[PDB]
């Protein structure tokens, strides 16, 4: 870790160590890294004008389902969809009744057509009255199809969201549990926030017990799904958010900070450095570099696409076609049989 001031064993008083203490120690005269800039550190050392302004967000998210079998299913499950089809066939019997006191294959086929707009040829029964049902059954068939389409769109409604993104103001995050296996990096600046925030003491410990030595393991836990949530500053996190998109960042960056080089006090260069990085911003260099690396990564937003899933039922249909034509040799046998 970069390191934080901590109790030195029995002594209980010690330098922040890590990257910074080496700096106090003089092992490294100047520190170049992605270091957030904070007052607790600031008293000890000089800091350059912050290079970046990154804010803490929570980098996590898992898969969001989209049923392959859901759209037709609206019929399947209803079960009045199939049965009524058969009753369309039954209407033929009523028509025969209409015929009385004024072909079965053609009728059933005719019924199938209204579901499917077959327009085969013969048309409505001789009785005008009988034909009225044709209008009715096709009416309802039409309605059903359209209604289905509307319910197909009801599936499209989607709009079921986990909505656990706002951790700072989020109810779930505040009252931690075993369903909130939450961490940060062992010895991370946010720990200072939890430390100083007695308001967050609960969370401080809740967090502490799950902390990691590094980001690679911390990101992995969420990826491995070992830990449901991960907390870290955005600049490190968002790039990863782009990198996978299996994981997501949520809520509003909190505790904003500037990035500035860490160096031992009195460095006669820090001021020049500050001017230099200032120029880097002024000339667009800083800006040019940030686009240069971050820009390379990108992921899709909340845009919906069909993705060739639901098409398999039709695959089934084509398989049924094969079965059909196989049956067809026996159907022609029937003509031959009446030989």
């Amino acid at each position: 870790k970069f390191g934080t001031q901590e109790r030195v064993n029995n002594s209980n008083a010690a330098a922040w160590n890590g990257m910074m203490g080496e700096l106090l120690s003089g092992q490294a005269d100047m520190i170049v890294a992605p270091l957030t800039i904070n007052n607790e550190r600031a008293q000890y050392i000089e800091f350059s004008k912050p290079f970046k302004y990154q804010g803490l967000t929570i980098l996590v998210k898992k898969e969001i389902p989209r049923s392959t079998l859901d759209s037709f299913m609206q019929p399947f499950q209803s079960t009045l969809w199939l049965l009524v089809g058969l009753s369309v066939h039954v209407v033929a019997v009523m028509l025969y009744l209409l015929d009385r006191f004024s072909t079965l294959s053609s009728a059933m086929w005719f019924s199938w057509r209204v579901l499917l707009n077959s327009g085969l040829g013969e048309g409505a029964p001789r009785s005008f009255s009988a034909r009225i049902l044709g209008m009715v059954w096709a009416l309802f068939a039409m309605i059903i199809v359209a209604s289905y389409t509307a319910n197909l769109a009801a599936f499209l409604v989607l709009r079921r969201p986990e909505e656990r993104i706002t951790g700072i103001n989020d109810p779930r995050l505040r009252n931690p549990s075993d369903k909130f296996i939450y961490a940060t990096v062992k010895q991370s600046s946010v720990d200072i926030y939890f430390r100083r925030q007695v308001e967050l003491s609960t969370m401080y410990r809740h967090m502490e017990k799950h902390n990691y030595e590094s980001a690679a393991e911390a990101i992995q836990a969420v990826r491995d799904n070992k830990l449901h949530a991960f907390i870290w500053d955005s600049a490190v996190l968002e790039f990863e958010a782009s990198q996978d998109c299996d994981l997501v960042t949520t809520g509003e960056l909190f505790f904003r900070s500037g990035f500035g080089i860490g160096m031992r006090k009195d460095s006669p260069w820090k001021q020049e450095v500050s001017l230099n990085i200032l120029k880097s911003h002024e000339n667009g260099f800083m800006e040019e570099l940030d686009k240069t690396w971050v820009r390379y990564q990108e992921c899709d937003s909340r845009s919906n696409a069909p993705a060739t899933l639901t098409f398999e039922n039709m695959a089934g249909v084509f398989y049924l076609v094969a079965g059909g034509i196989v049956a067809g040799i026996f159907l022609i046998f029937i003509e031959i049989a009446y030989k």
């Binding site: 859901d70 499950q77 209803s78 079960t79 009045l80 969809w81 009524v84 009523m94 009744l97 209409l98 009385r100 006191f101 004024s102 005719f110 057509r113 209204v114 499917l116 707009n117 077959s118 327009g119 085969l120 040829g121 013969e122 048309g123 409505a124 009785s127 005008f128 009255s129 009988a130 034909r131 009225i132 049902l133 044709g134 209008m135 009715v136 059954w137 096709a138 309802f140 039409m142 059903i144 199809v145 359209a146 209604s147 289905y148 389409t149 509307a150 319910n151 769109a153 009801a154 599936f155 499209l156 409604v157 709009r159 079921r160 909505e163 989020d170 109810p171 505040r174 369903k179 609960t202």
Partner: protein
Amino acid sequence: KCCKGFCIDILKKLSKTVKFTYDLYLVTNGKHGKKIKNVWNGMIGEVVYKRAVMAVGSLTINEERSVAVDFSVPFVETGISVMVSRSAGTVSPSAFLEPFSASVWVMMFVMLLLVSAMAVFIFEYFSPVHGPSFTIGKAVWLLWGLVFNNSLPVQNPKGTTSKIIVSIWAFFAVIFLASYTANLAAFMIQRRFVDQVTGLSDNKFQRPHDYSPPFRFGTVPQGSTERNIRNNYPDMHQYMVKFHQKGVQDALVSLKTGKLDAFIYDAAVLNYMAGRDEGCKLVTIGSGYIFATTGYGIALQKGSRWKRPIDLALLQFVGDGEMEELEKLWLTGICHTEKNEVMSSQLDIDNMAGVFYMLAAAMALSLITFVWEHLFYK
């Protein structure tokens, strides 16, 4: 053991506000006071015995507590309530687009009348002076089919004028279908899925035995309400006693498993339960009005009055933004109830039945026309 919550936070406010040091412990016998025979039980007992000066908690207010002791704050709104995981379904398929019916249905009949005029133009063209005359009847049946999503083999009209007139009609039919589906599109919204139970007056609660289906409502033992129930419906209280549970999670699980049909409790807590549900399958009744109106009250020795002095500090606290901070701090609840919306993979079979009833009516009508031919006049 450490303690948490907004009451705890209020107590912190009170350390500073009334400037009084306090000792806090937990009750053993009976939780919220329970009165059996000669002697009362719970925190109220420790308030009566002089062990406790003031009792704090989720305790509800009642007249009996009032004769014995008092609370002058009423900080929160709570009432008896039930959480039901239920749903709302479409009725009559948007009444078969009833709105079109006031103007649209008549116009359809009117549309048929337009068709007669079209046929009249057409008849002359067809016969300046086999049996195409069936076309007008066929055209109406034929025109009607073209109106709804085609799917009519019908007959082929020839008269030149009919093709144009048909096109004007077809255009109409198409845009009709557009509006139809827009009506259908609007319905997707109408497929509102909100819990379908009534308040305390509902018959499912009042006369549970009559329904064939087996369902039961219940509440926690030794509660203030038991008495209300016994002072509302004694029989209902006995039924609740038969199916008694004890912990929140008992009820919760029972509700999630369906072991318990629905559950009544202090709404405030139940709201908080909705505030903490995993999966969001539980809701309040209708709007959530409990139908029992009360707020939390804090005990004081009947002789004791720091409450009158205490009251002043409390109100400004009401006025102060923090109560809402405490609300946001502890009462914030996930999945705010925006008029809820959802999509069914089972579609609607009872709405479908409604459709089928219309269908069945038509079948009956055709039987009537059969009868007319059956008994056709000489």
